Each structure stands twice: as structure tokens, then as C-alpha cells.
């Protein structure tokens with residue numbers, strides 16, 4: 221009975237709910253399933269209107285969801301996107317918090333491509349985490365999508381491509397678990413940083429958890445300090461021990477990139493492609509969740 225934008229029937233909450241609650245929806249016209257993000261019109265720091273423009277700039281790219289509608293419904297700012305499947309965090313949990321090397325490699329390939337595509341559209345994501353990557357539905361079931369441009373920001377001019385300046389004393393924009401070491405140091409995020417976080421995501425998939433996860437502290441501030449310290453005292457070689465050398469090569473390459481350097485995305489994809497080949501995995505999309 222409730223119809224957002226006089227078109228999308230509101231269904232079950234999938235939520236929830238910091239910066240916005242997410243609801244299931246159905247288009248009255250097409251019959252297509254949608255996802256509806258709701259944001260309170262009274263919040264201290266608005267984001268939904270800014271995020272919608274970013275999404276529009278990204279339109280037409282592979283693994284970029286299409287924004288169907290923007291509106292205002294009661295005391296809420298409303299955004300409508302095509303419905304996507306479970307996130308990599310949902311699937312990770314569903315697979316008992318361990319992925320096989322084949323799955324990690326299949327995911328790594330598309331994830332590097334999504335980050336590269338955002339970078340081609342003059343933005344850095346700044347919140348690269350498994351929760352922000354979603355599988356498509358039906359025939360797009362094997363496609364990895366990137367979402368959430370809430371912390372995204374321009375790294376270069378749209379017209380000239382002049383990179384933003386180097387700056388320190390920056391606040392932690394994003395999740396502490398996947399933040400780059402340079403982000404912990406208060407350094408201005410750039411392209412390298414999105415890929416460094418990606419490397420921690422892949423290692424998290426490999427290990428089941430990172431060495432800086434589950435650290436017990438007395439305050440939020442004390443916990444970030446513990447993560448920051450743990451992450452800096454953990455060398456790439458210790459973190460990646462017992463895993464193929466490619467994960468260390470990927471991480472060291474990311475940390476060795478200069479602030480304004482254009483990353484060699486092709487090389488990074490090829491590292492994992494070559495490993496995939498050497499491992500003798502079959503060239504299909506039979507992920508771990510398809511074997512349970």
C-alpha cells in the first residue's frame with residue numbers, strides 16, 4: 221500500500237541503519253525488484269543527495285548499480301537503486317568465514333576492475349570493505365558490484381586531471397580494519413589507498429580474520445590506536461605467511477606507489493590471473509557458496 225515515489229512498493233527492511241536503513245521494494249510499472257535507502261531529513265551531516273550525483277557520474281560502468289529514483293518521503297530523503305544480491309560479507313559469513321583460494325582470485329579480478337573504473341571517473345572510494353561489494357542477481361549472479369559513495373571524493377580535476385595536493389593531519393575516513401597504513405598516519409588518501417585496503421580485504425578472505433581484529437580496548441579511540449599499532453607492527457611477510465607470494469607482491473606494490481601515481485591495475489590483475497593458472501583451477505564461476 222505504501223508507495224515511495226508513487227511507484228516503488230515498500231517491502232521488508234534489509235537495513236540497518238547508520239547513515240540510512242535499506243528496504244526491499246518493487247517497481248509497480250516493470251515489476252523489477254529494487255533497494256530503497258532512506259535518510260533522515262533532520263541528520264547533522266547529510267550524504268544521500270551528494271552520493272546520488274556520484275552514482276550518476278559512474279553510470280554505464282560494469283558492476284555499477286543504476287539509480288532509478290531520488291526523492292523526499294515524509295521526513296526522509298529517499299534513493300532507489302536496482303536490487304542486488306548478497307554482499308561479500310554476507311557470503312563470507314554464509315561460507316563460515318573462510319574462502320578458498322579460487323574464490324579469492326575470482327573476486328580479486330573483478331574487485332581491482334571496479335576500483336579502477338571509479339578511478340577512471342576521477343573518484344577514490346575511501347571505504348573499500350567486503351560489505352561494499354555485492355553480487356548481482358539472476359544472470360548477473362557472477363558479477364561483483366561496488367556500492368556506497370558516502371565517503372568517496374574527487375582525487376583529480378574532471379577536465380585537466382590535476383591531482384589533489386599532498387596533505388597530512390587527516391581524520392580516519394572509513395573502516396579502521398581495512399584502512400591503509402598511510403590513512404592511519406593521517407595522510408591524504410589517493411588511488412594507492414583504495415588498492416591497499418583491497419589487499420587487506422583479500423587477506424581477510426584468505427585468513428578468516430586480520431591480526432588487528434578483535435583487539436579489546438576501553439574506548440573507541442583506544443581501539444583504533446590498538447589497530448593502527450598492530451597493523452604497523454605486522455610486516456606484509458608475517459601477515460601473508462603460508463599464502464601464495466602474490467598477496468605480498470600485491471600489498472608491497474600498493475605501499476610502494478607514490479601519492480599521485482597511477483596504479484598498474486593490469487599488472488595487479490595479472491599477478492592473480494597467473495597464480496590462478498598455476499593452481500590448475502577450472503575456468504568457471506563456481507564460488508564457495510555454490511558448493512555448500
Ligand SMILES: Nc1nccc(-c2c(-c3ccc(F)cc3)ncn2C2CCN(Cc3ccon3)CC2)n1
Pocket residue numbers: 234235242255256257285299300301302303304305306307308309310350351352354367368
Ligand atoms: N541488496 C541491495 N541492493 C542494492 C543496494 C543495497 C544497499 C544499499 C543501497 C544504496 C543506495 C540505494 F539507493 C539503495 C540501497 N546500501 C547498502 N546496501 C546493502 C549493503 C550490504 N548489506 C548487507 C551487509 C551488512 C554488512 O555487510 N553486508 C545490505 C544492504 N542493497
